[PDB]
Amino acid sequence: PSLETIKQDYPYQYFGAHPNETETTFRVYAPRATGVNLMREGTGWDCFAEPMTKNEDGVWEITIPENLTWSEYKYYIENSDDYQPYGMARIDPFSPQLAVTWGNDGTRNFNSIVCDRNYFQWTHKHIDLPHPMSIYEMHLSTFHDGNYRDIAHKIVDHMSYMGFTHVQIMPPFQTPIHQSWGYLVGCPYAIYERHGTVDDFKYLVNHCHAHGIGVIVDVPLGFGVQDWDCGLANYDGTDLYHHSGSRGWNNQWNSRIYNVGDTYVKNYLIGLCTYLYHELGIDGARIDAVASQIFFDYDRGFWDWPRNDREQVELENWELFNNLGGDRYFEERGYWLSEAVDFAGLRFLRDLHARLQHTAPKFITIAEESRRVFPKLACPVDEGGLGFTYAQNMGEMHRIRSYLQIPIEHRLIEHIEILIHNNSAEKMVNAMNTHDECANGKVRLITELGNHIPLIGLAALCWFRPGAPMIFQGDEFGEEGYFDVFHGVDWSKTGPYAALHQQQISNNFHDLNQLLRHEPALARHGINSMIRNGSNNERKWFSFIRWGGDVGFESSDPKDHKDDIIFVRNETPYPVECHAEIYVPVAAEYRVIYNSIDQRYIGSQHYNQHDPYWTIHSAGQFLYFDLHPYQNIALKLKN
Amino acid sequence: PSLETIKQDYPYQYFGAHPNETETTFRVYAPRATGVNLMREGTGWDCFAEPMTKNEDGVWEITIPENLTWSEYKYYIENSDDPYGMARIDPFSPQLAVTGTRNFNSIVCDRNYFQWTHKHIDLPHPMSIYEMHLSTFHDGNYRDIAHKIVDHMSYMGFTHVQIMPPFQTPIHQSWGYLVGCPYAIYERHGTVDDFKYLVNHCHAHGIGVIVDVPLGFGVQDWDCGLANYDGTDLYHHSGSRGWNNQWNSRIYNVGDTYVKNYLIGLCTYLYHELGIDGARIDAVASQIFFDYDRGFWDWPRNDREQVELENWELFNNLGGDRYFEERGYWLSEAVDFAGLRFLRDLHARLQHTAPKFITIAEESRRVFPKLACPVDEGGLGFTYAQNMGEMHRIRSYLQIPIEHRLIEHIEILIHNNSAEKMVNAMNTHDECANGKVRLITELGNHIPLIGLAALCWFRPGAPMIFQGDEFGEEGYFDVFHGVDWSKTGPYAALHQQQISNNFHDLNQLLRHEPALARHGINSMIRNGSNNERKWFSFIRWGGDVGFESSDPKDHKDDIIFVRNETPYPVECHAEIYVPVAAEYRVIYNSIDQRYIGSQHYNQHDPYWTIHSAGQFLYFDLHPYQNIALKLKN
Amino acid sequence: IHNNSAEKMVNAMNTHDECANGKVRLITELGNHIPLIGLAALCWFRPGAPMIFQGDEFGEEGYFDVFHGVDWSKTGPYAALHQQQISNNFHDLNQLLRHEPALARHGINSMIRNGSNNERKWFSFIRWGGDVGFESSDPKDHKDDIIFVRNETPYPVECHAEIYVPVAAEYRVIYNSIDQRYIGSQHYNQHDPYWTIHSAGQFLYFDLHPYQNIALKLKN
Structure with a gap:
């Protein structure tokens, strides 16, 4: 590995603080700086004690002949040029961690810390964790306002009953505004000190991996906080890191x-992203606010945004734009997407995925991308995509929920069926709910449904669809309150002493996760692992089948179709005659593997006084049986 | 006055901390609270030390048998009903005590401690305003800020200062638009009494003080804020x-x-307790519109059938309905009539509690022509509206080359028939934040700025600029660096002194000319224009008589304004109508070397005299030339 | 309304049965009396003999049975405002009916469509004063023709009316459902309701106000 590929692919191995037994090397890029001085506790924070040396490429370097490991430091950075003379203490942009103190008068101090990449002793840094996948979205301080090691203990204790394959941790990076939820990052490389040390964060990842649990982390890749003290803006007296x-x-x-x-x-x-995988053990990133990285005119508020001079767009960029799905006309605004795309952002995200294929091929990414006007955004680079492993189902629950709020007589089952069978080119994270959907006085899903019975079946639909289902902390127990940082998860609604409704909802998620981890027909997230299996619009039920393997309806061989699942959903919320007529690939005996009317989820009802896991004979290639209210049910071939 | 009127009109006199010489009485509203205890340092901050008594009206009271003046306190509040219980601050704290976790305490304050010399001067609103942000202006005590305000405002000559939200905020980089305790002055710059000093000092030197009041909303934080106060939404909608x-x-x-x-x-409190001359009410459009400046949310189209006939009566009196083609619904469907009614009532009540107190609408939609009109004339009562959107339109006109624009385009923006009295801001903290191009940068050099500020000063309204505009600051606004004070002082650049001199001279005229006193647009009349030569003229009336008289006695304080927009040194022969056949004197001339340095076209005395030929002045206009004359002697 | 009926009709707005046995009276259903004013007008101006049941004249909301009588304190000049307003509207409508030759006939062919507009929510019909339709443009043939316009929009909106007439001349309002006498002091009725207008050709252009029902004749 040449210095040049280190500087390109593993830049944190060159830039920053690098101790050994003998000495400590510091390097920081500041190409318009006039001077850069190493500030440390060693020299009593004298701003002029230790001048650093600008090399050819604009990188200030120095070696101190001590092991500085665990000691604190900043860069005193000057730019005295005639384009206000700039001069202030700055943190290292590659700090794995910041030391934060409060002054005598309420003044915040940020130093960088010299970290030892080798102090933490990994037992399970990288485990072969596939993405079947189910995701528990959580926020550190509201989940458990403690040290990462204690949060880790609570993650594995809760997830090992709840059965999610991955945890999605909202942004765990250093922020000076706790109330930003972590989306306003100071030093992007720095783990949030609120919960302890970078090595405490490693322990969390390690503890997760030791119990078969993946860690996905939110990364605000598109932007940073404005603050100069803990941040990157105006670093060398100029717009080094940001546009002007x-x-x-x-x-x-x-x-x-x-x-x-x-x-x-x-x-x-x-x-x-490379650092997240190789230094912190993280299995993936959700890239935040992707739409605003690739659109001048969307999720950027009000500004004088420049229309592209489309004459200046290079072919490579037209190629990427067309492959993503090509142009759209917004008649209301009177312009084309081609005129609004930030081609540099679009190209930057494809390169991010192209590089990660070499630097960390197992690392997965999720696009948090809200506009959803490029059908092929979360597709492999070499298939015309940006390279995102997954796209999030942004806007989908709004459509599903509008549908559900229509009274049954007034809505067509075809409307929910088009949303399910969407011919998506992307693998999707199908979130039922997110931190955002239950913040700022929004009505939470369960509140809107009116009681928990309809949620049991909606959760089944979500799990049985091709994709990685996701929920937000609280959803496992029907939490009805909103998300903010002003209060935590009420842990008293978990475990064996929780209210009946809270255990019921949690049991459903536990059981859906047991099927998801073990059923082969639920591993694949490509839409084509699903096919419509007929519906009836006046009975208000539909069915679909998840293929167990590569063979569909061409064959009638029992041993071709053993792992297939037949899923049926009745949307009728009251107990009338609802007779089911359900196609199957093979004529044989089918066994119920999941039933939403089980007393375990919905308590004693007049319609569930029978074993929910019943057996049935196909009359040819057709199952006939009675559907009960809100019944979501799934079937396989019996042995 | 009866307790009932005190509760309604002066509630800070009943609620809060009220010390005697022998007793300190504490009151806080918390109707849905299971229990409320006084916490104080005199009792080592035990929550449960001394509970308070809930009267029938939801108000918890307790007297302590000692004058607690200057000592710190909170309220522990609980609510068991269907497990909330935490230490909150007094909603009426004049100031918080602050101490990586932050402790926020209230402070028993002595309203009578500060010895006022000039609490209420008789300062008219003729008015010119200097918009400023405290920590970027001078990051020290309110007293030191006061000294620099007065010292600086001495040369610049602005009559009033506009101070960006000066209230307690947990987030400094919110610019103060996210307030914890709305009655608390920002602890960063010292005490409520230090703030009183600053108002008193400004007033003793003839300076008004207007503060920004984020009246529509508060920060979400519980420790320093008001939300979920008694375990429910006491102060905010659900x-x-x-x-x-x-x-x-x-x-x-x-x-x-x-x-x-x-x-x-x-607001009543800003005037009576703090001597503040006025408030700019922030984010007025988001208070009165569901669909505007509230971000993206599932907002409720009003049912036009179900709108109260008194709201229709207000709405129509504000100027009526409009169809929004681009979104496809009427305005009437989008009005938050609660918010709109509330701001009507704010002013209805201040006409009683504080009649000299002025307000400025910071209202960005500008779809009600009569928003800033008196309540009885069909408005919301705001003394002023801010000219939001206006400079954007003027800057677009000026970006068009003169060959391809009509003088009538700028004449229509100036002669705009406004029913409102306008703060005419040249620039604001907002228009020069977040990478935006500042006006002076965009003009390309300072020469066009000299005249543009003249135009702003001579049209009816209160001209406003933002800190740095007095000396041609090109940088952005943010809270990460100060005003550059080297752009004043002995070592400043010529152009910085020149821009500054221009603002000095314009504020002298604005202070002393009867024809620049009135902010009603009917104090101005179109006085001719010529599209090819790109000049227009207007008159500012000295008194109540227009062209119906021709007597000198009636017109001796009339101001004749002429603006030449031609940048080229060519033919601008001007025919300027005057109301009296007589001699006129130049009082203001934008081509003075004091403003633009030495040029081929200003090698003459700028303050000339001319006899009318009948009722017309014939003279030559030079590049970018803005000029004002009066009757001589 | 344009039902091409072969029968002369008694057009009852309400009947002893329609308001018996705890059924919802017309007044309660509309929500308040303002829509009642214009609906009563519609009923009077259609070809037919209008009918109401005792109490309807003062907006009675109780139901009909033999156990309670007409509340007579809702009649006369000390009745409550809404009560006198509804009564006044019926009084004025009967004065037009007793006197206007274009309200004498109950044959439906004494009425014709005079255009409509779906977005603005207004329609207009004409009552012939005599035996002569649009075949004549002469003022002597249309002296007693009534031009009726109905705006069903229950709030202020852009509502420019374009109304065909049989003669280019001066027209005069003979009935106006927004008279303060019926609906009280409102934002939209601060003008004299009995205004005059010159036909701009064989059309009239004016602004309909909420719930406005209005009738015009040739002036003189």
Whole structure:
């Protein structure tokens, strides 16, 4: 590995603080700086004690002949040029961790810490954790406002009953505004000190991996916080990291937008994903606010956004744009997507995935992308995509929920069926609910349904669809309150002493997760592992089949179809005659593996005084049986 | 006055901390609270030390048998009903004590401690305003800020200062638009008494003080804020009506009487307790519109059938309905009539509690022509509206080359028939934040700025600029660096002194000319224009008589304004109508070397005299030339 | 309304049966009396003999049975405002009916469609004063023709009316459902309701106000 591929692919192995037994090397890029001085506790925080040396490429370096491991430091950075003379203490942009103190008068101090990449002793840094997949979305301080080691204990204790394959941790990076939820990042490489040390964060990942649990982390890759003290803005007296002018601000978040056209900045941001995998053990990133990285006119608030001069768009970019799904006309606004796309952002995200294929091929990414006007965004680079392993189902629950709120007589079953059978080119994270959907006085899903009975079946639909289902902390027990940082998960609604309704909902999720981890027909997330299996619009039921393997209806051989699942959903919320007529691939005996009317989920009802796991004979290639209210039920071939 | 009127009109006199020489009495509203205990340092901060008594009206009281003046306190509040219980601050704290976790305490304050010399001067609103942000202006005590305000405002000559939200905020980089305790002055710059000093000092030197009041919403935080105060939404609407998503703030329930009185109370309090001359009410459009400046949320189209006939009567009096083609629904469907009614009532009540107190609408939609008109004339009562959107339109006109624009385009923006009195801001903290191009940068050099500021000063309204505009600051606004004070002082650049001199001269005219006193647009009349030569003229009336008289006695303080927009040194022969056949004197001339340095076209005395030929001045206009004349002697 | 009936009709707005046995009276259903004013007008101006049941004249909301009588304190000049307003509207409608030759006939062919507009929610019909339709443009043939317009929009909106007439001349309002006498002081009725207008050709252009039912004749 040449220095040049280190600087390109593993930039944190060169830039930053690098101790050994003998000495400590510091390097920081500041190409318009006039001077850079190493500040440390060693020299009593004298701003001028230890001048560093600018090399050819704009990198200030120095070796101190001590092992500085665990000691604190900053860079005193000057730019005294005639384009206000800039001069202030700055954190290292590659800090794995910041030491935060409060002054005598309420003044926040940020130092960088020299970290030892080898102190933490990994037992399970990288386990072969596939993405079947189910995702528990959580927020550190509201989940458990403690040290990462104690949060880890609570994650594995809860998830090992709840049965989710992965946890999605909302942004765990250093932030000066706790109330931003972590989406306003100071030092992107720095783990949030609120919960302890970077090595405490490693222990969490390690503890998760030791119990077969994946860690996905939210990364605000598109922008950073404005603050100079703990952040990257105006680093060397100029826009080093961010665009200049209004292109350098996202007015929706009041954040600074990264200049990913700058080689160093491109390597800095792709290198954070590489760092997440190789230094912290993290299995993947959800990339936040993707739409605003690839659109000038969307999720950027009000600004004087520039229409593309489409004459200046290179062919490579037209190629990527057409492959993603090509142009759309917004008649209301009177312009085309081609005129609104940030081609540099689009190209930066494809390169991010192209590089991660070499630096960390097992690392998965999820696009948090809200506009959803490129059908092939979360497709492999070499299949015309940006390379995102998954896209999130943004907007989908709004459509499903509008549908559900229509009275049964007034809605067509075909409307829910088109949303399910969507011919998606992307593998989807099908979130039933997210931190965002239950914040700021929004009605939470369970509240809207009116009681928990309808949720049992909606959760089944979500799990039996091709994709990685997701919920937000609280959803496992029907939590009806909103998300903010002003209160935590009420743990008293978990475990064996929780209210009956809270255990019921949790049992459903536990059981859906048991099927998801073990059924082969639930492993695959490609839409084509699903096929419509007929419906009836006046009875208000539909069915679909998840294939167990590569063979569909062409064959009638029992041993071709053993792992197939027949899923049926009745949307009728009252107990009238609802006779089911359900096609199957093979004529034989089918066994019920999941039943939403089980007393375990819905308590004693007049319609579930019978073993929910009944057996049945196909009359040819057709099952006849009675559907009860809100029944979601799934079947396989018996042995 | 009866307790009932005190509760409604002066609630900070009943609620809060009220020390005697022998007793300190504490009151806080918390109707849905299971229990409320006084916490204080005199009792080592035990929560349960001394519970309070809930009167029938939801108000918890308790007297302590000692003057607690200057000592710190909170309220422990609980609610068991279907497990909330935490230490909160007094909603009426004049100031918080602050101490990686933050402790927020209230402080028993002595309203009588500060010895006022000039609490209420008789300062008219002729008016010119200097918009400023405290920590970027001078990051020290309110007293040191006061000294620099007065010292600086001495040369610049602005009559009033506009101070961005000066209230307690847990988030400094919110610029103060996210307030914890709305009655508390920001602890960062010292005490409520230090703040009183600053108002008193400004007043003693003839300076008005207007503060920004984020009256529509508060920060979401519980420790320093008001939300979930008694375990429920006491101060804010419930569900998604109680969150502004553009700001991630909590919107006030102004349909609750106590909250209506708390908010109107705060303005009354700004005048009577703090001597503040006025408030700019922030984010007015988001208070009165469901569909605007609230971000993206599932907002409720009003049913036009179900709108109260008194709201229709207000709406129509504000100027009526409009169809929004682009979204496809009427305005009437989008009005938050609660918010709109509330701001009408704010002013209805201040006409009684504080009649000299002025208000400015920071109202960005500008779809009601009569928003800032008196209540009895069909408006909301705001003394002023801010000219939001206006400079954007003027800057677009000026970006078009003169060959391809009509003088009538700028004449229509100037002669705009406004029913409102306008703060005419050249620039604001907002228009020069977040990478935006500042006006001076965009003009390309300072010469066009000299005249543009003239135009702004001579049209009816209160001109406004933002800190740095006085010396041509090109940088952005943010809270990460100060005003550059080297752009003043002995070592500043010529152009910085020149821009500054221009603002000095314009504020002298604005201070002393009767024809620049009135902000009603009918104090101005179109006085001719010529599209090819790109000049237009207007008159500012000195008194109550227009062209119906021709007597000198009637017109001796009339101001004749002429603006030449031609940048080229060519033919601008001007025919300027005057109301009296006589001699006129130049009082203001934009081509003076004092403003633009030495040029081929200003090698003459700028303050010339000319005899009318009948009722017309014939003279030559030079590049970018803005000029004002009066009758001589 | 344009039902092409072969029968002369008694057009009852309400009947002893329609308001018996705890059924919802017409007044309760509409929500308040303002829609009643214009609906009564519609009923009077259609070809037919209008009919109401005792109490309807003062907006009675109780139901009909033999156990309680007409509340007579809802009649006369000390009755409550809504009660006198509904009564006044019926009084004025009967004065037009007793006197206007274009309200004498109950044959439906004494009425014709005079255009409509779905987005603005208004329609207009004409009552012939005599035996002569649009075949004549002469004022002597249309002196007693009534032009009726109904706006069903229950709130202020852009509502420009375009109304065909049989003669280019001066027209005068003989009935106006927004008279303060019926609906009280409102934002939209601060003008004299009995206004005059010159036909701009064989059309009339004016602004309909909420719930407005209005009738015009040739002036003189």
